[PDB]
A paper describes a structure:
Meromycolate extension acyl carrier protein (AcpM) serves as the carrier of fatty acyl chain shuttling among the individual FAS-II components during the progression of fatty acid elongation. In this study, MSMEG_5634 in Mycobacterium smegmatis was identified as a novel acyl-AcpM-binding protein. MSMEG_5634 and its homologous proteins are highly conserved among mycobacteria and belong to the SRPBCC (START/RHOs_alpha_C/PITPs/Bet v1/CoxG/CalC) superfamily, containing a START domain that functions as a lipid-binding domain involved in eukaryotic signal transduction as well as a cyclase/aromatase domain for the biosynthesis of polyketide antibiotics in Actinomycetes. MSMEG_5634 can transport acyl-AcpM away from FAS-II by forming the MSMEG_5634/acyl-AcpM complex and contributes to intrinsic sensitivity to FAS-II inhibitors.
The structure of MSMEG_5634 was solved at 1.9 Å resolution. MSMEG_5634 has a helix-grip structure that contains seven-stranded antiparallel β-sheets (named β1 to β7) and four α-helices (α1 to α4). α1 and α2 are two short consecutive helices located between β1 and β2, and α3 is also a short α-helix which is followed by the long C-terminal helix α4. The seven-stranded antiparallel β-sheets and the long C-terminal α-helix α4 together fold into a barrel, with a deep hydrophobic pocket wrapped in the middle of the barrel. The first two short helices α1 and α2 fold into a V-shaped structure that seals the bottom of the pocket. A clear linear electron density was observed inserted into the pocket of MSMEG_5634, which might be a chain of a fatty acid based on its shape, indicating that MSMEG_5634 may bind fatty acid chain-containing substrate. In the refined structure of the MSMEG_5634 protein expressed and purified from E. coli, there was a linear electron density, which might be a chain of fatty acid inserted into the pocket of MSMEG_5634. The overall structure of MSMEG_5634 is similar to that of the TcmN polyketide cyclase/aromatase domain but with differences in the conformation of proposed active site residues. According to the protein sequence and structure, the corresponding residues of MSMEG_5634 are Tyr-27, Arg-63, -65, and -84, but the side chains of Arg-63, -65, and -84 all point to the outside of the pocket. Third, the ligand-binding pocket of MSMEG_5634 is more hydrophobic than the pocket of TcmN ARO/CYC. The interaction between MSMEG_5634 and acyl-AcpM was disrupted by the substitution mutation of W30A in helix α2, which formed a helix–loop–helix motif together with the α1 helix at the bottom of the pocket.
Numbering used by the authors: 0 to 143
């Protein structure tokens, strides 16, 4: 078990559209502020077990992360495990749910591994809360 942060946005989009945009990895660089590089070729189709590598920046720190799709259920849920260099271990639970006026796109992000159990974890957690929320706001601005 690990501590976690939670972020969400409501978009004026039906869930199937919100899913299409949220899983369009080729456009993450237009709204995900922490993304810095892809380090493996992006697949045409995602599936449970898909593995992708990227480099992210959080509060000025770079980290190369291997992402594994451990749950994949369009158009409503995905879970991604991340193993970063230096002892970073994260789990990203994504959920897309229909609402009255569109759909919510929210994430629970568990932050762990030795690196984030240590004193830097609350720095990283606070920075990620802001960065991911701002990114979701950009997602909404770009796609809706």
């Amino acid at each position: 078990s690990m501590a976690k942060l939670s972020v969400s946005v409501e978009v004026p989009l039906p869930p199937e559209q919100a899913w299409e945009y949220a899983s369009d990895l080729s456009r993450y660089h237009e709204w995900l502020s922490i993304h810095r590089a892809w380090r493996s070729k992006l697949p045409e189709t995602l599936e449970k077990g898909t593995v992708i590598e990227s480099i992210v920046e959080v509060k000025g720190m770079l980290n190369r992360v291997r992402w594994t799709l451990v749950h994949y259920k369009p158009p409503q849920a995905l879970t991604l495990n991340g193993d970063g260099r230096g002892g970073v271990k994260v789990k990203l639970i994504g959920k897309i749910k229909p609402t009255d006026n569109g759909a919510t796109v929210g994430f629970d992000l568990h932050l762990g591994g030795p690196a984030l159990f240590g004193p830097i974890g609350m720095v990283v957690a606070a920075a990620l809360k802001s960065d991911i929320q701002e990114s979701l706001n950009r997602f909404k601005q770009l796609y809706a």
